[PDB]
From a paper:
Here, we report the biochemical and structural characterizations of the unusually promiscuous and catalytically versatile Fe/αKG oxygenase [name], involved in the biosynthesis of fungal meroterpenoid emervaridones. Through the oxidative decarboxylation of αKG, a reactive Fe(IV)-oxo intermediate is generated to activate a selective aliphatic C–H bond, which is normally difficult to cleave due to high bond-dissociation energy, and then oxidative products are generated following radical recombination.
[name] also catalyzed the formation of cyclopropane-ring-fused, highly congested 5/3/5/5/6/6 and 5/3/6/6/6 cyclic skeletons from structurally distinct meroterpenoid terretonins. Interestingly, the unnatural substrate 15 shows a different ligand binding mode in the active site. Notably, the lid-like loop region was not observed upon the binding of 15, while the conformations of the other active site residues were almost identical. In this structure, Phe133 and Ile231 are located close to the methyl groups of C8, C10, and C13, and potentially form hydrophobic interactions. The C6 enol group of 15 is close to the iron with a distance of 3.7 Å, suggesting that the enolic hydrogen atom is abstracted to initiate the cyclopropane-ring formation reaction via the proposed path c in Supplementary Fig. 9. Interestingly, only the N150A variant lacked the activity for the conversion of 15 into 16, suggesting that the direct hydrogen bonding between Asn150 and 15 is crucial for the substrate binding. In contrast, while Ile63 and Asn65 on the lid-like loop region are important for the formation of 4 and 5, these residues are not essential for the reaction with the unnatural substrate 15, suggesting that 15 is mainly recognized by active site residues but not via residues on the lid-like loop. These observations indicated that the lid-like loop region is crucial for the steroid substrate recognition, but not essential for the meroterpenoid substrates, which is consistent with the absence of the electron density of the loop in the complex structure with 15.
Residue numbers in the entry:
A (entry chain B): 4 to 52, 72 to 280
B (entry chain C): 4 to 280
The structure:
């Protein structure tokens, strides 16, 4: 167990092996700097002086970020074998004000009640992709992980604060956070904001944190068929090819003429 | 255990008690006959199957293309969505079965259960089999889903009335299905309903009569599970006429987990706020 910084061209099989062994990693140059700027600009345009879904606020988020090949290559190998389809769970902007204290160390899957039935050898209930807007430093509250704690049994006490390993990222790097990885944001002891944005996916049989059916139709039709399924507009296929999120007998996209 | 037939005014505690011991039961007079007949009429009025007259009628113009495929029961039948889904027995049981562990529940799926004459016996199964998380679940854990099978026609042994195996909900997950001789047919009049948790081994019988065995099913499951059916193709006029309870059941409102954490949100607010319900 150890925090690994790997390049963008790392083989997918190496990321999964590091994910199983260490429970987290950082994929550098996950997004290019211009995509990092576009999503912040689009969010700033929407909430120009209340924030809603990131896919509603940012065209780059729903058209570019949610089509990221790394997110889908990882999610396919993590959820595919057991659950079949996956879809978008939630997405937020992670903005730390200067002077913010250390966030409590937690696992993301704690709000799944079925996580208590889960065993550390089972596939994760959700996975998070935390992408850096500003740089992440140990002093501005960058996310801290506890490599290997994803294998701890249910009910294991949170890691001690001294066992937390800060994650250092340039803008565009991504930290991969499976739902079982103990982690928390640090205390921003600097004068500037530490800003990041995240995506999360989970099995299609799980209800997402966010619904996207308040989004206008043109916003939906400009999405790829993959992102449309991610955001809850297409019927999902379980591993047995039994279908959930159906429209009576047929597909939801056929009933809505997507 | 034993298959219990209980009257409508049975206390809620006794019903959940029976569900814990035997894993299933029937509530007599769950619905009145006229209500379940309204659902069928509304379904027939939506599908609009061609009904051949007494003799050939020399049809030329406007032939065919009238029949629609069956959609959600909440879309086809106003009685289903405006009355059946507000049933106090469904919500009393779902509250006590899902509330303490999952918080909110919502609609999972409906079904038109019509057994053809000569239909053979259905494989004996558990309804929660299509939840992969059922392999992690213990028999003492709460159920992953519950089904309410309401009879439209009479349910008999010969017409393939649903069979249950009382107590089989407590078997370990690796347990083989019950033998055919273990199954207990469920005899029901129109309006009765079979209460069917996801862990109860059951199956439709062979319909060895010349008439259809007809009925309707509702199912609910915890709010953190994705329902079989989506209802977001439904017209907005339809959603406005459902109760706030049914709007939450059919996926138009934000759901609350047990720890007051919200899922099915609209960004940071409620879905019903972003849609202006
Ligand atoms: C909005 C959320 C909900 C999320 O904050 C929730 C469930 C929010 C409420 C919580 O009790 C905690 C603090 C336990 C929590 C997490 O700890 C997460 O981690 C989650 C699951 C986030 C996550 O994992 O990914 C980011 C992108 C995100 O938007 C997510 C889905
Ligand atoms: O913002 C961060 O660095 C970490 N945030 C979380 O883990 C969270 O919000 O669940
Ligand atoms: O039709 C019946 O009596 C029982 N049906 C089922 O168990 C089913 O459709 O899953
Ligand atoms: Fe987190
Ligand atoms: Fe069944």
């Amino acid at each position: 167990p150890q925090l690994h910084y790997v390049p963008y061209d790392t083989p997918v099989e190496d990321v999964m092996r590091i994910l199983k062994e260490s429970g987290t990693l950082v994929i550098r140059n996950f997004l290019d700097q211009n995509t990092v700027q576009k999503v912040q600009d689009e969010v700033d345009d929407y909430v120009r002086n209340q924030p809603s879904n990131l896919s509603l606020m940012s065209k780059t988020y729903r058209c570019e970020v949610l089509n990221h090949p790394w997110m889908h290559a990882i999610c396919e190998r993590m959820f595919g074998p057991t659950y079949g389809d996956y879809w978008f769970n939630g997405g937020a902007i992670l903005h730390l004000e200067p002077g913010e204290n250390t966030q409590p160390i937690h696992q993301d899957h704690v709000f799944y009640q079925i996580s208590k039935w889960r065993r550390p050898t089972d596939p994760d209930l959700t996975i998070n992709f935390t992408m850096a807007l500003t740089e992440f430093t140990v002093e501005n509250g960058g996310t801290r992980v506890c490599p290997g704690s994803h294998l701890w049994e249910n009910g294991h006490a949170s890691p001690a604060e001294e066992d937390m390993v800060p994650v250092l990222m340039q803008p565009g790097d991504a930290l991969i956070l499976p739902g079982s990885m103990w982690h928390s944001a640090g205390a921003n002891r600097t004068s500037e904001y530490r800003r990041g944005f995240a995506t999360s996916f989970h099995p299609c049989h799980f209800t997402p944190i966010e619904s996207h059916h308040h989004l206008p139709r043109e916003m939906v039709e400009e999405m790829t068929p993959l992102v449309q399924k991610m955001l809850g507009f297409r019927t999902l296929n379980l591993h047995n090819n039994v279908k959930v999120w159906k429209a009576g007998e047929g597909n939801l996209e056929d009933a809505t003429g997507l």
